[PDB]
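Bug report (template v2)

What were you trying to do?
Predict the complex of my protein with sodium ion.

What happened?
Run completed; filing so the output is reviewed.

Input:
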Amino acid sequence: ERFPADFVWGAATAAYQIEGAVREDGRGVSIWDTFSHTPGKIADGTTGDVACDSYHRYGEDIGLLNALGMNAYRFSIAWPRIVPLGAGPINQAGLDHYSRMVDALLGAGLQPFVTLYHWDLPQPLEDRLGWGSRATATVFAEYADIVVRQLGDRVTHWATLNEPWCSAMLGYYLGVHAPGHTDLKRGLEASHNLLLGHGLAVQAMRAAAPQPLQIGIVLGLTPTYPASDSPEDVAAARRFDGFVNRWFLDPLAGRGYPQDMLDYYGAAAPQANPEDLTQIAAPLDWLGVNYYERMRAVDAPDASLPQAQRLDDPDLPHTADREVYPEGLYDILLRLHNDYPFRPLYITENGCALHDEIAEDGGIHDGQRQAFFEAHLAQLQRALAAGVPLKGYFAWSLLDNFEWAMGLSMRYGICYTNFETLERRIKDSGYWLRDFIAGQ
Ligand code: NA
């Protein structure tokens, strides 16, 4: 029933999703400014131009985290605020902003867990192919250096990237995230340059740091299960597992890219010399897992790569946008612990979206979200029992925000955001986490 006395308890956000103030204090244009301002890309016509106004209202965010009894806050720094041209001079006003925010967090007893890259590539870099270019890896590392030099006296726990599978595949293969390209080959190239940027950044950060750091990367992992034991469905499960999970885990673990996937991708695979693989495998202090759903896979020979489609289970619960499968969190952690070298581990996102409203009494009665937390935290207890070296849990999200291609329409917060007034209110699931955490 109990977590470690020193366990990290937080909630998570990303800069473009919450900050607003997109032109303020020298901020440059990101690929998500471009993409959200492109008609038709966002479901509901919204942008991150205002979002939660957390650029001005991070004090209110800190107020929520305190009310919840949290001891940590996962958030991202916007590259466009720091190096507005992407490769070029720094913007001291950007760094001063996050400096003040860091001091405010520490003053409140909240450990900052900083993500350097949460999808907001400076547009001038995208103009030169973005993650399709190796040069972008080099300048990511330079950005990482600058940030750690200024803030690494106070922040020990850093993640280079958030969810490179999204940035590469949704951004450059499927076209549903910024920058919105639709080419497999470019998606795969982007994956390699993201990974190379990660590895270069780790090295740069260790050199630039004023004290030893605890550096990780954050991956979205989706445990995958064949719908039957047929060779066709099992192979479809392996292909999906490789496309999402092992493509990133293996090179990070020093195992190269998975050979099955290299053979499957054929001519679309990127050109990956041994020197790049050595850099990609730069030793980490921790690994973050973002966990939402499983994939129950059936073979789908006529679909695009990886030729595997989800077989829905209507007896399972569904949220606004996903199937619920808490057991998958235990499965993927047990696999990491036993099969891969990363440790310790943090759950850097876990949460759900629902059609939340303010009820007549003023509260938000999101029982399904409460039950979602309760069920996933039970699986974490099981994983801890099995010896998994788990050191923290961050709910996605602290508050409702701009949820990428779904816009403001898809509410993941444990706090409700009124996007007209910018008032935040804690949901019932938030109060449950508060009281659960206080018990711990
Ligand atoms: Na439902």
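What did the reviewer find?
The chain has one domain: 1-440. The first strand starts at residue 8 and ends at 12.
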